[PDB]
Design an enzyme around this catalytic site. Structure first.
Site, PDB file in Angstrom:
ATOM      1  N   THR A  12     -35.862 -48.658  83.427  1.00 42.37           N
ATOM      2  CA  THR A  12     -34.777 -48.111  84.384  1.00 42.37           C
ATOM      3  C   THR A  12     -35.152 -48.577  85.832  1.00 42.37           C
ATOM      4  O   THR A  12     -34.095 -48.560  86.544  1.00 42.37           O
ATOM      5  CB  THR A  12     -35.340 -46.513  84.358  1.00 42.37           C
ATOM      6  OG1 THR A  12     -35.130 -46.041  82.936  1.00 42.37           O
ATOM      7  CG2 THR A  12     -34.269 -45.791  85.347  1.00 42.37           C
ATOM      8  N   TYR A  25     -27.090 -43.621  82.289  1.00 38.95           N
ATOM      9  CA  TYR A  25     -27.308 -45.215  82.690  1.00 38.95           C
ATOM     10  C   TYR A  25     -27.874 -46.131  81.426  1.00 38.95           C
ATOM     11  O   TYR A  25     -28.146 -45.435  80.407  1.00 38.95           O
ATOM     12  CB  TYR A  25     -28.227 -45.251  83.746  1.00 38.95           C
ATOM     13  CG  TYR A  25     -29.567 -44.740  83.334  1.00 38.95           C
ATOM     14  CD1 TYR A  25     -30.260 -43.538  83.483  1.00 38.95           C
ATOM     15  CD2 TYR A  25     -30.637 -45.760  83.202  1.00 38.95           C
ATOM     16  CE1 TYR A  25     -31.372 -43.327  83.054  1.00 38.95           C
ATOM     17  CE2 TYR A  25     -31.896 -45.662  82.577  1.00 38.95           C
ATOM     18  CZ  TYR A  25     -32.272 -44.383  82.689  1.00 38.95           C
ATOM     19  OH  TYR A  25     -33.753 -43.983  82.432  1.00 38.95           O
ATOM     20  N   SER A  58     -38.378 -49.997  77.694  1.00 39.52           N
ATOM     21  CA  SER A  58     -39.822 -49.944  77.209  1.00 39.52           C
ATOM     22  C   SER A  58     -39.865 -48.950  75.743  1.00 39.52           C
ATOM     23  O   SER A  58     -40.900 -49.127  75.131  1.00 39.52           O
ATOM     24  CB  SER A  58     -40.558 -49.791  78.188  1.00 39.52           C
ATOM     25  OG  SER A  58     -40.755 -48.286  78.616  1.00 39.52           O
ATOM     26  N   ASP A  90     -41.299 -45.489  79.921  1.00 39.02           N
ATOM     27  CA  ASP A  90     -41.589 -44.680  78.621  1.00 39.02           C
ATOM     28  C   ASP A  90     -42.855 -45.452  77.968  1.00 39.02           C
ATOM     29  O   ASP A  90     -43.644 -44.502  77.317  1.00 39.02           O
ATOM     30  CB  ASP A  90     -40.181 -45.114  77.642  1.00 39.02           C
ATOM     31  CG  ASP A  90     -39.162 -44.241  78.286  1.00 39.02           C
ATOM     32  OD1 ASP A  90     -39.184 -43.354  79.051  1.00 39.02           O
ATOM     33  OD2 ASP A  90     -38.199 -44.259  77.220  1.00 39.02           O
ATOM     34  N   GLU A 283     -65.392 -30.077  64.467  1.00 39.67           N
ATOM     35  CA  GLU A 283     -65.276 -29.771  63.063  1.00 39.67           C
ATOM     36  C   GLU A 283     -65.124 -30.766  62.078  1.00 39.67           C
ATOM     37  O   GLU A 283     -65.068 -30.483  60.777  1.00 39.67           O
ATOM     38  CB  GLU A 283     -64.036 -28.979  62.953  1.00 39.67           C
ATOM     39  CG  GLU A 283     -63.843 -27.603  63.844  1.00 39.67           C
ATOM     40  CD  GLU A 283     -62.535 -26.894  63.695  1.00 39.67           C
ATOM     41  OE1 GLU A 283     -62.078 -26.411  62.717  1.00 39.67           O
ATOM     42  OE2 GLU A 283     -62.150 -26.657  65.175  1.00 39.67           O
TER      43      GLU A 283
END
Ligand SMILES: N[C@@H](CC(=O)O)C(=O)O
Ligand SMILES: N[C@@H](CC(=O)O)C(=O)O
Ligand SMILES: N[C@@H](CC(=O)O)C(=O)O
Ligand SMILES: N[C@@H](CC(=O)O)C(=O)O
Lengths: 326, 316, 316, 326
Positions: A12, A25, A58, A90, A283
């Site tokens: 971006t 965009y 990305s 991202d 656990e």
């Protein structure tokens, strides 16, 4: 002034919209030369040279680009004083950790993006790029690993993650905090990552054409085992579980991954929970099942380290040691 | 002097570690008798990492059937998927009396175990008349949290549960709550979701996005005839190309597709990089992937139309 | 097609750096004309570190007088004390139309200045019919924040403004707001505070607590005949012994004393370590010291009785 | 097992109420021996010795107790393997930073308290004390400065602050993050404070009977200058301003402190804002007025460093350098 190399990959930060006030965009349109000329203040602090490596969003980042970036930085280390990588937000946290483990160049390597397109009102790209270059030009930035610089903050590539879908302040090192803050073009570093990075790791991708196959499966109520089974049937080298709570797994998923581990699939337990470690001695008896606990590495970060671990070993005890050191 | 009748429905979890029974859970906190007339019923006894549709349906039906027999409900539950059960009940419970979920992050036998005071405060909340009509609640670490926004933010911290987008409804001090917020999204008796006669829920799975993501998990859900798929996207709901390709095909061949995000706070919005109308996708808003799965399952009991599912994701 | 009329009242701040005029502020964002009919008026032009009672009274009177002449208000303001002005107006504005405050953390001439989009989003919020009846608002970093809880959390971050106890009311995306919360505490036309004829406000000062704290600041406020003193206590409103001694005397000799806390989140509660009833003190709840000062000044226009002031601090 | 010394000073960790379910209590009642016996698991990890230094609420903490603690730790360093200081939470962040600057003992010094009284349901004191002893017993805890251990987290004494009035999770290092997390009695340290501490500082309180007088004044709309004037008239050696925003001051307060600085009063600009630095080169010309910017030190932490700076120098340039190094 220091010589700084900008390696552009898209994002971006290079995106554009038809209006400064509307949100739609497309990513990775404008070239590296336009981003640089958009910040004429860069010439006050560095001699900037731009190269376009790829131009992608990305969300489409991949192994091949990672290998290209690591080899390029390692090859061109002697030719420049520091690197800035412009990148989509991202998956910047994934690329940053990959380079954190594979870059051998001692000089600062800084990643940067923008949450708002270049065309938007109050676009964050220009000042982000300025501060990324500030960081790459700072002598004190060396030997701290690969960095992400966003919202006036220098973040280590291991802990940095995108915490919010839209906020310009989205990037935070949510477990151990930032390394330093940037004000008036200067950084007061008060921290450095203790985990081994860059030239202190054994991972050497210089001759690799590909990386081991590692996928990620999600856990939740009533989770299907079919995603995990699909990765096993494709012969994946490793599987990261985005577990619930402290790395726990829905029984069906547990059963499939336990069977796969005995055939040699590497299985790393991470967590969908956004902060905190997936620990040993909770656990899940990892030693009994041949599993590895991811610590504070979230699922996509755990995938990065598992892929690289699998270039060295498939033994779960040795992989756990890797997950305790890097 | 009369105290409210509060029913504890037990499902397991570390607060019952789920191995100890509901009567043992109650007797451990004798001060409960100072604030409520408590009756306990064991529904299941499982770790909540093994929570499933059948337990969800049982709980919603039990609360709706027994609403007029008590003054409020507390559900003891594992912490791992409490945020999913809480939202499911938030959408399907038609009892307007308080329904409060609670768990514990430390074992009951451990130093400074949080279970006892957690349960006390959960009963305080279920007994407060002010707690009615606020939806299903989660009460942890002296805080009342709405079932829609509440999520587990840390793997081990006793303070892990937070409503990370819109904040808590009230804090508890000295057995009293100062409520300053209530959820605006429609819940409980204001939703159309009615599970009273359902034996099963539509099949909805979740796929994760990351660099170089395989399309095989998404393909496997499609091959199995899943009714819906939730994408844990990157950033603002974005999809790795291979995953995008598979979900675009699925959306045009019957499957409901909701874009959520692996990012822990913030909405997956419309009108960003993905043309949802073109692909027939639904944007999840602030619902994280496991929450979005809850609403998508219930939406699919009403409709398969993407525009109508989007409207559901805009209202609940 | 008609757009709402929005009045911008300018007071200064970095968003106007306060040196540039209100007409210059408007013309810098031409897209405002796409969403509103904007008219600007300069009230003052100061750094908000120099905000004072006179400006507060001017703003409340102007908004109340001009309510029927516009559809909503935006107040441009310095960030340093915006959280105080916002709460003062939250209590004294009787116009139910949206009143939105906004500032900027970066200079207008700086790289990636936040002022332009901040102002755009503030006008978006003031123009949204859904913003009415939510009290006075602060709009910063794509977020709508209620004037009571909003506070500046970081000295430099563009994301500094947060409602740290109860969360935001809504987020702004693509010029639209999804409101999921509203403040339950009584505001605007639901408060009794009426400053329409006041030329001054009761004198209220703030003293800080810390290890070895001097009692001299508290003593100086008492010697000057202050109407009230707010203590920025340590922890849950606690007082250093010397400061405690001075405020206990003051409370029994006319002065209103409110215990707040230097701690940035959480309530200063009753029923902890300080017997407020014994000393005639008031606990501030989640109001931080500068917010507690706002409410204490206005309470003192109505009453000097500690029990009645405590009730005010429980309702507003 | 290591020898660990508990120095007790009071606090809610030593407090008691008449009911496990009601909030009222009194601080600093029970003795150090009762706290230790309440955690019999301590005998599994350390040989614990308790000494009662004072028994006060930390809202009443003062210079004299600080001097007592620093001298005692420095004197008794050779006699033990590590120290735990039980303390009220209200000013623990102040005492921790004071000891961070004045302790010369190389061995771990860990502070701990409890947000809930010992008598309360789910009291946090017992496990906090256990984890504090774990931390003091860990070899890796040495040379990290004075520590605060609360809610499974090891925090550096400089950045740690109380963020919430009632939450057991209240203590956070809000600018730079924690040093490590504690799980199952083990710590994974990933950070250490870069600012100079303990034996790397010049502050030596071993022979001091008192500390320079430093007070704190608050800023807000319409702020009275009378608090600041009262400190000046008493001949205070230094004044810390809890400013608005980036260390800004209401004009009346500014005017009084500027006049006092020219007479020799040390003036440090801090901020009431809970995170972020009070920077140089913002709206206040510190060099012109003789003021010092506090950086990320909040007002009560800035008071600690200013008092100690004033044992060495009254020159504003040298004090600013101290505020840039410690
Ligand atoms: N879709 C974009 C998001 C961004 O750059 O912020 C990318 O990752 O390339
Ligand atoms: N595994 C447990 C975790 C917990 O109870 O905290 C559960 O969710 O049932
Ligand atoms: N000093 C300025 C700070 C700002 O505007 O951000 C003010 O409050 O007016
Ligand atoms: N008033 C107490 C608060 C606490 O210990 O939590 C103190 O500081 O001593």
């Amino acid at each position: 002034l220091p010589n700084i190399t900008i390696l552009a990959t898209g994002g971006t930060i290079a995106g554009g919209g038809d209006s400064a006030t509307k949100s739609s965009y497309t990513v990775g349109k404008v070239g590296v030369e336009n981003l640089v000329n958009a910040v004429p203040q860069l010439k006050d602090i560095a001699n900037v040279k731009g190269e376009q490596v790829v131009n992608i969003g990305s969300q489409d980042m991949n192994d091949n680009v990672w290998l290209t970036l690591a080899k390029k930085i390692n090859t061109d280390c002697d030719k420049t004083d520091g690197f800035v990588i412009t990148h989509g937000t991202d998956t910047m946290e994934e690329t940053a950790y990959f380079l954190d483990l594979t870059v051998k160049c001692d000089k600062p390597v800084v990643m940067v993006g923008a949450m708002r397109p270049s065309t938007s009102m109050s676009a964050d790209g220009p000042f982000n790029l300025y501060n990324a270059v500030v960081t790459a030009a700072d002598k004190a930035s060396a030997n701290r690993g690969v960095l992400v610089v966003m919202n006036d903050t220098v973040l280590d590539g291991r802990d940095v993650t995108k915490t919010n879908t839209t906020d310009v302040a989205t990037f935070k090192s949510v477990n151990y905090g930032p390394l330093g803050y940037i004000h008036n073009g200067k950084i007061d570093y008060q921290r450095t990552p203790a985990r081994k990075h860059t030239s202190d790791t054994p991972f050497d991708v210089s001759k690799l054409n590909e990386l081991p196959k590692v996928g990620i499966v999600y856990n939740y109520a009533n989770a299907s085992d079919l995603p995990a089974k699909a990765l096993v049937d494709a012969g994946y080298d490793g599987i990261v579980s985005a577990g619930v709570g402290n790395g726990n797994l829905y029984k069906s998923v547990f059963d499939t991954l336990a069977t796969a581990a005995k055939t040699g699939t590497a299985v790393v337990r991470s967590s969908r929970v956004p902060t905190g470690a997936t620990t040993q001695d909770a656990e899940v008896d990892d030693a009994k099942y041949g599993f590895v606990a991811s610590g504070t590495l979230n699922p996509q970060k755990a995938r990065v380290l598992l892929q690289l671990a699998l270039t060295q070993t498939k033994d779960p005890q040795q992989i756990q040691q890797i997950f305790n050191q890097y």
